[PDB]
Amino acid sequence: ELQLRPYQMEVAQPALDGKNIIICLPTGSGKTRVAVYITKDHLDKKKQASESGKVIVLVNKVMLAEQLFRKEFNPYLKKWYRIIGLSGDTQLKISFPEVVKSYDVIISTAQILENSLLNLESGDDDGVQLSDFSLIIIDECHHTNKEAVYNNIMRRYLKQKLRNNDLKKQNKPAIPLPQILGLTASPGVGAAKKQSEAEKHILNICANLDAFTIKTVKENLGQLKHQIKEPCKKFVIADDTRENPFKEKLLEIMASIQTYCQKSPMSDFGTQHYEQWAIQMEKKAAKDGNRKDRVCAEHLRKYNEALQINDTIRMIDAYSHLETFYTDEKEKKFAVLNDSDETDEFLMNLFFDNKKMLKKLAENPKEKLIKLRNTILEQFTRSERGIIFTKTRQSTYALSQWIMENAKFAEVGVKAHHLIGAGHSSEVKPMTQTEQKEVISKFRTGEINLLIATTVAEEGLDIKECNIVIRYGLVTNEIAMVQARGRARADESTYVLVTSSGSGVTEREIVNDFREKMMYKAINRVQNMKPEEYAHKILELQVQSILEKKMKVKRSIAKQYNDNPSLITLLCKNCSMLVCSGENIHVVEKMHHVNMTPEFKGLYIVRENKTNGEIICKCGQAWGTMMVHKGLDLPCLKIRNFVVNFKNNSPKKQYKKWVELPIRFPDLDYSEYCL
Amino acid sequence: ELQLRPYQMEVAQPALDGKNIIICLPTGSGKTRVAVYITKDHLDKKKQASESGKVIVLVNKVMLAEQLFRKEFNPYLKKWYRIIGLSGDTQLKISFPEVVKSYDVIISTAQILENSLLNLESGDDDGVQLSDFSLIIIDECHHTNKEAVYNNIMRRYLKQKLRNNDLKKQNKPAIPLPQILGLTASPGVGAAKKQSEAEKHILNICANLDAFTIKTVKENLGQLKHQIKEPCKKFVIADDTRENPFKEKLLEIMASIQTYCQKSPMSDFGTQHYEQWAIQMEKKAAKDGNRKDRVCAEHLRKYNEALQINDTIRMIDAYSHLETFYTDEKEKKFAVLNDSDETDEFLMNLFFDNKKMLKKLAENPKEKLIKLRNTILEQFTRSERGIIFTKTRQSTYALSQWIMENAKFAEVGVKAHHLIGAGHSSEVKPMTQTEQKEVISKFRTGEINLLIATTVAEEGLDIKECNIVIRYGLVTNEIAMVQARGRARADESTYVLVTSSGSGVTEREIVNDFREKMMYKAINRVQNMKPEEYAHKILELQVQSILEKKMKVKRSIAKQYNDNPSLITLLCKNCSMLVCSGENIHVVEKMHHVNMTPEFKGLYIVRENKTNGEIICKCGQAWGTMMVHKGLDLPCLKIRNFVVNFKNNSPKKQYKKWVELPIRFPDLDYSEYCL
RNA sequence: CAAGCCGAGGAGAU
RNA sequence: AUCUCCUCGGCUUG
RNA sequence: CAAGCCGAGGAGAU
RNA sequence: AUCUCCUCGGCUUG
Ligand SMILES: Nc1ncnc2c1ncn2[C@@H]1O[C@H](COP(=O)(O)OP(=O)(O)OP(=O)(O)O)[C@@H](O)[C@H]1O
Ligand SMILES: Nc1ncnc2c1ncn2[C@@H]1O[C@H](COP(=O)(O)OP(=O)(O)OP(=O)(O)O)[C@@H](O)[C@H]1O
Ligand SMILES: [Zn+2]
Ligand SMILES: [Zn+2]
């Protein structure tokens, strides 16, 4: 039943017989079907060869593993051989080492295999070796980078390959090495200005992947051009001339607070440099133990980010963010007072006094939003799907709120939903993988006609067809832009970019376009190179990478060696008071820290407002949570909100992290808490 | 919205229609607005001409490019056309060749364009040609000199122009050449005594720029005289009669050390000739391999420079400099001994024994500083900005320390800060471009009322208004003086010069004044000349310059031809011992050198005190650093601290430089370091 | 469904 | 090399 | 933020 | 033509 096409033959013909190589075709070129066909051919050759045929497929994203399991690999290969799809979300509840030798076909994230090999080296588990495999297939090869996961696996493979070469000169016996295949569309450039450097980056990629070729289509390219239609390019610009009243009022309060705290701005307002200066002032205040330097800095930061989003988000969202922050602060203050400095009262009373007028001033008119609405609605009328790319998740939420609230979209009847990434990213609600999964399914079937997504959807997150692809103030790198452009896969596509004229964004878009042109100019060059000098370059890059990794591991071992028991005193950053000693702390689960002595309980204050409570200091500085672990409600504390004081010279140092502290703490002896 | 003035029309009228010319107006005459208006007119003519309009602007300084991008060009031209500002600091991260044909307006440093053209000639990159442009504009035309960057570009242009002329006689087709405009205020004189030679220099400038005219204002000159007010000239002199005690003690130790090392001074003390003699003795000691000749010479040099600054700097700074130098020497000696000649002990013990008495003798009183303070404070009281020009950066630092420490300035409340140049200049901390940028911004907005700067601020570094301009022992050339004088741009200005009466400095100031007078006397002359003989002179100078450049390139190619693999033996200059062979050395990044054999590791000693360590010899002579490159911590060595010994005739030669050695070294073969 | 931990990648400013 | 901002994967607990 | 490399310009003395 | 002292730009590495 398997079906194929000419360009697929031409690209995949070399790999049919050895030739561990890479393949670079645009999106929607059937690369997945190429891969399944190649795997089938390899397994057939093994069977007719009376040799063990093992195939492993590696994908950076978890979803794509199940996607290939459901759509391409299993349907076209179910009957001939045994197949399985692994992932972190999925329970590989047997084990990796033997399922490698139980199904002959593995589809798993690279991290699982990497963990298995590390376990083997540690000797804790029997583990697995690459020799057990006969064919490795890697999707999204462009991620093979300085020390990415793919790069780690390939560095192990290349060390084995160098050992085998050395033996070939020394001893005939050698460890067999499985074939390697790579799939990609935009290999990318490591920020190379000279085309020579771009080719150097391409050769580095090839050496990491041991491809020895690229094998891009050259004969039937016309057929691909006919089948694939590139979206029409559209540029959109804007200027922030309006917004004068409320911006002016906010800047007036800005200047007032600054002069009150006498902060030299050392930079222009509304920029990342100012935030960095604010953080430097935070650190200085920590090293000095004074107030009036950090609360003001955080408030300035909140105002700055509010202003930044205002240029790209409606003022209502910024006002709500600020109000929520101040309400949380006031709840903190009320709790601390309930248990029972002038600048804090100044800030809160300033905001309270001007709260009503600020609300009235923000509610009034005086935007990219109006023109975005114009473009989207006129396009929808002309069409009778849609994707938005932005910077931060709350921007996606604001866009969803805007499209729901406005009645014009309801008149059009366009369906929309907000999609974002997972995990915790500094005050953005983590999103569950399953939730993203039903969102993508709902969009796939048709109910959602508009999908708002962050960089996650830029890569992978494959869809059959997306008619409209519009980016909104998001330009990062050539790979992101090109993959977003190719994600349309529609017969007729509209690629739009929206941003501010003052900001350097259109320049970035054209830079990515030139990077694509340069990628072609370099890929065609490398495809035409002398085999001897070529292989020489691959060897040089391989050996250099292996050596660099070896020195890096040596310096990682040599960097962390102190591990002293107790040589410090931990204080509260906000109020320089002795909070804990260097030994009273105890470790649990080899990851968390806690203080158990009741003397510590007599210092801090417990607070809960909302299923684990949080801790606060006498000065209102948040410390941690009340972890419920194996019965015990242990008070876990975050070093992110503390200060250190060594026993000698008292050099104050803030780490925002535990491992960055070279000295280790003792584990929790439950026997110390008997009765 | 664009606005203009009559003299601007009169000067710029000829350029409106061809007439590749130059313009010479004083500072703050709106030359920038003249340039933007001319560019706008040219682009409009191209548009109505249905022809491609390309404009490129060249500036020697990096900052001025962004300055024109922010203040003059973009604000007045944003809407009509597309604009961009390039620089080394800025990432032209697309490429030069196509951004030339992407925005129609380029503002970049000349070096970038020069590099692009050299790349084109080499054929490595597609590159760019001047034909792609339609109008070239050059600021600071006075820098078009013997083989400056502007001169290189103009020499290429003039070779093309001569080819086009030859074809015009031979073949009608010819490569079109963009118009050329030059902007300046003080074209300058190439040290001409006869007014005929001054006019010759002016004609050389014009020929390099192909100006064919000067077009200085002659009609509305009265209006410029009214609008611009020249600063009042002030001379100040001083004598070093005082300072007898500590100077006498220093000269006593001077004589003691000299007699101990029996050095014929061959010159007077406290002069550059003595330093040159000391360096000659250094070289002789290198050619003989003896001690007691270089350490003493360096100590004498340090004493000499200390004395020189004492005439213009407080003794505390000189004492601190000497103490730091000797502490560094002693740390070196302690390290070398830690691993485990009588004159060195003599020097160190002499300084140690007299250290306390020297400190006590320097602390006592017995200066230009007191009168400088008097003048500055009385002027500040009279005024109810300020700029200081000096020789060396540490002088600026000393001035900042003096103004901060003294309480009288605090009573006045004058704000001050030290500004200096960037880069490494033999034991002066390099300064970052961004740092200079925020310094200039802070002064511009008002917080800094006093800006101490070196020759960098003399040229460019434009400021709206600088009330006070005072120079402190700095007279170099007529251009520096005139530009510093015009940099005031204040309605009322005070130009002051301070220096020693004995030194020949007031003479230099009046020489620069006469040079300005002579520049006018020659510019008015050249503006009135016969067109035929004029063009003849321009042609003669152009052809002469092109021919000279051609012979220079021929002799540069013919000079470096040996490039032998290994014919020498490298020894330590201080101790004549075999340090390395002619082949054991290896090259990396095509710029650095290193020795990898452990036998070399068994010879030198590693030292680190402070993120790269340094190397020292068994005799305490510093050699290089431990470069951390692409993983490897390769030991990089500086030929500046070594001696050479050829395999024949053993002629010792010190180069202070690698390229000056005609023989080349092999690159680093990483394969030689496997495992 | 929530919390925590470990590593990695990309962009922007020093 | 440092700081900031975003994103991915793996592990643990409830 | 630090280090290194390449060229160029100016001043002073032989 | 040589030596010394200052300044500019470009490139690379971390
Ligand atoms: N040989 C083929 N004949 C017909 N259609 C094909 C063939 N190969 C692939 N396709 C089309 O490919 C579409 C799926 O594209 P697919 O996901 O395989 O592309 P891709 O290049 O792997 O994508 P991406 O770059 O997003 O990972 C299917 O709708 C099918 O129509
Ligand atoms: N046509 C004009 N009308 C009014 N003011 C003008 C005009 N042209 C220039 N100016 C004044 O010029 C000042 C800026 O001077 P500018 O930097 O252009 O001088 P410049 O001659 O280029 O300087 P420099 O010699 O330092 O490079 C502005 O403050 C503006 O007041
Ligand atoms: Zn506290
Ligand atoms: Zn030595």
Whose CA is closest to B628, among B608, B605, B658?
Answer: B608
Cα–Cα distance, B454 to B456 (Å, whole number): 5
Contacts of B185 (CB under 8 A, 6+ apart): B24, B25, B26, B27, B29, B31, B482, B483, B486
Query: What's the DSSP call for residue B230?
Result: P
Residue B126 has, within 13 A of its CA and on its CB side, a CA count of 11
* ∠ Cα B97 B103 B107 (to 5°): 75
- What letters, b where the CB count within 10 A reaches 16 and e where it falls short, cover B366-381? ebbbeebbebbbebbe
Whose CA is closest to A490, among A457, A470, A467, A461?
Answer: A467
Query: What's the DSSP call for residue B144?
Result: -
Cα–Cα distance, A466 to A497 (Å, whole number): 16
| End-to-end CA separation in angstroms for chain A | 71
Cα–Cα distance, A438 to B153 (Å, whole number): 63
Nucleotide nearest to A432 (CA to C1'): C1
> Which residues on A lie below 8 Å from B95 (Cβ)?
193, 514, 518
Would the CA dihedral through A415, A421, A423, A427 be positive or negative?
negative
- CA of B645 relative to ligand 4 center, distance in Å: 15
Q: What is the CA radius of gyration of chain B?
A: 29
Encoded amino acid at A238, one letter: A
- CA of B396 relative to ligand 4 center, distance in Å: 36
With contact defined as beta carbons under 8 Å apart, do A402 and A408 qualify? no
Sheet hosting strand B135-139, strand order edge to edge: B21-24, B179-184, B135-139, B55-59, B105-109
Whose CA is closest to A624, among A606, A644, A646, A609?
Answer: A606
Contacts of A502 (CB under 8 A, 6+ apart): A239, A240
* Ligand 2 contacts CB of residue B5 (under 6 A): yes
> Which residues on A lie below 8 Å from B673 (Cβ)?
547
Coil, strand or helix at B458:
helix
- Look up tokens 């242009």; give the residue: B157
Coil, strand or helix at A501:
coil
Using CB atoms within 10 Å of the CB of residue A176, give its burial: 0 to 12 exposed, 13 to 18 middle, 19+ buried.
Answer: exposed
How far apart, in Å, are the Cα atoms of A102 and each of A65, A78, A83, B210? 18, 15, 9, 82
Would the CA dihedral through A107, A109, A115, A117 be positive or negative?
positive
Name all protein residues with C-beta less than 7 A from any atom of nucleic acid chain E: B 143, 145-149, 191, 272-273, 276, 423-424, 429-430, 432, 434-435, 476-477, 480, 508, 591-592, 611-612, 625, 627, 636, 638, 657-659
Binding residues of A, as ranges, are: 572, 575, 617, 619
Structure tokens at B555: 């002799």
In chain A, what is the greatest distance between 2 CA atoms, to the nearest angstrom? 85
* Ligand 2 contacts CB of residue B33 (under 6 A): yes
Q: Which ligand is nearest to the CA of B479?
A: 2
Coil, strand or helix at A484:
helix
Cα A386 from chain centre: 23
Binding residues of A for Zn(2+), as ranges, are: 572, 575, 617, 619
Please name the helix (run of DSSP H) or strand (run of DSSP E) that holds residue B436, with its range, or none.
Answer: helix B433-445
Strand partners, B235: B497
Cα–Cα distance, B216 to B649 (Å, whole number): 63
| Cβ distance of B94 and A544 shorter than 8 Å | no
> Which residues on A lie below 8 Å from B102 (Cβ)?
510
How far apart, in Å, are the Cα atoms of A45 and each of A18, A79, A254? 11, 17, 72
* ∠ Cα B608 B610 B615 (to 5°): 25
Strand partners, A236: A498
Contacts of B277 (CB under 8 A, 6+ apart): B265, B266, B267
- Closest CA to ligand 2's atom 6: B30
Q: What is the DSSP pairing of strand A386-389 with strand A451-453?
A: parallel
How far apart, in Å, are the Cα atoms of B423 and each of B389, B393, B420, B426? 19, 12, 10, 10
The pick from A3, A4, A32, A60 for probing ligand 1's pocket by mutation, whose C-beta has the most ligand atoms within 8 angstroms, reads A32
With contact defined as beta carbons under 8 Å apart, do B605 and B617 qualify? yes
Cα–Cα distance, A148 to A114 (Å, whole number): 11
Encoded amino acid at B604, one letter: Y
- What are the phi and psi torsion angles at B247 (to 5°)? -60, -45
Q: Which residue of B has its CA nearest to A518?
A: B94
| Cβ distance of A547 and B84 shorter than 8 Å | no
* Breaks in chain A after residues, C-to-N cutoff 2.5 Å: 340, 366, 384, 610
Cα–Cα distance, A294 to A546 (Å, whole number): 45
How far, in Å, is the CA of B589 from the C1' of nucleotide F12?
8
* ∠ Cα A535 A536 A537 (to 5°): 90
DSSP letter string over A78-102?
A: TTTS---B--SSS---S-HHHHHHH
Q: Which ligand is nearest to the CA of B643?
A: 4
CA distance B335 to chain A (A): 24
Whose CA is closest to A548, among A130, A155, A162, A149?
Answer: A155
Residues 321-360 of A with CB under 7 A from strand C: none
**3-state SS string for B581-636:** CCCCEEEECCCEEEECCHHHHCCCEEECCCCCCEEECCCCCEEEEEEEECCEEEEE
| End-to-end CA separation in angstroms for chain B | 71
* Ligand 1 contacts CB of residue A27 (under 6 A): yes
* ∠ Cα A166 A168 A173 (to 5°): 115
Q: What is the DSSP pairing of strand B643-646 with strand B652-653?
A: antiparallel
Structure tokens at B585: 């050395």
Contacts of B523 (CB under 8 A, 6+ apart): B24, B187, B202, B214, B216
Q: What is the DSSP pairing of strand B632-637 with strand B622-629?
A: antiparallel
Strand partners, B616: B605, B622
What resolution in angstrom units was achieved for this structure? 4.2
Tell me whether B432 touches chain A (CB under 8 Å).
no
CA distance B81 to chain A (A): 13
DSSP letter string over B639-651?
A: GGG-EEEESSS--
Nucleotide nearest to B658 (CA to C1'): E5
10 Å Cβ neighbour count for A402? 18
Whose CA is closest to A522, among A192, A217, A212?
Answer: A192
Cα–Cα distance, B509 to B235 (Å, whole number): 9
Encoded amino acid at B168, one letter: K
Whose CA is closest to A67, among A149, A145, A139?
Answer: A139
Whose CA is closest to B296, among B341, B344, B353?
Answer: B344
| Cβ distance of B125 and A195 shorter than 8 Å | yes
Cα–Cα distance, A624 to A636 (Å, whole number): 6
Residue nearest to nucleotide D4 (CA to C1'): A276
Residue A448 has, within 13 A of its CA and on its CB side, a CA count of 22
Would the CA dihedral through B308, B314, B317, B323 be positive or negative?
positive
* Ligand 1 contacts CB of residue A485 (under 6 A): no
Q: Where are the beta strands (DSSP E) in A232-283?
A: 232-236
Residue B58 has, within 13 A of its CA and on its CB side, a CA count of 25
* Ligand 2 contacts CB of residue B60 (under 6 A): no
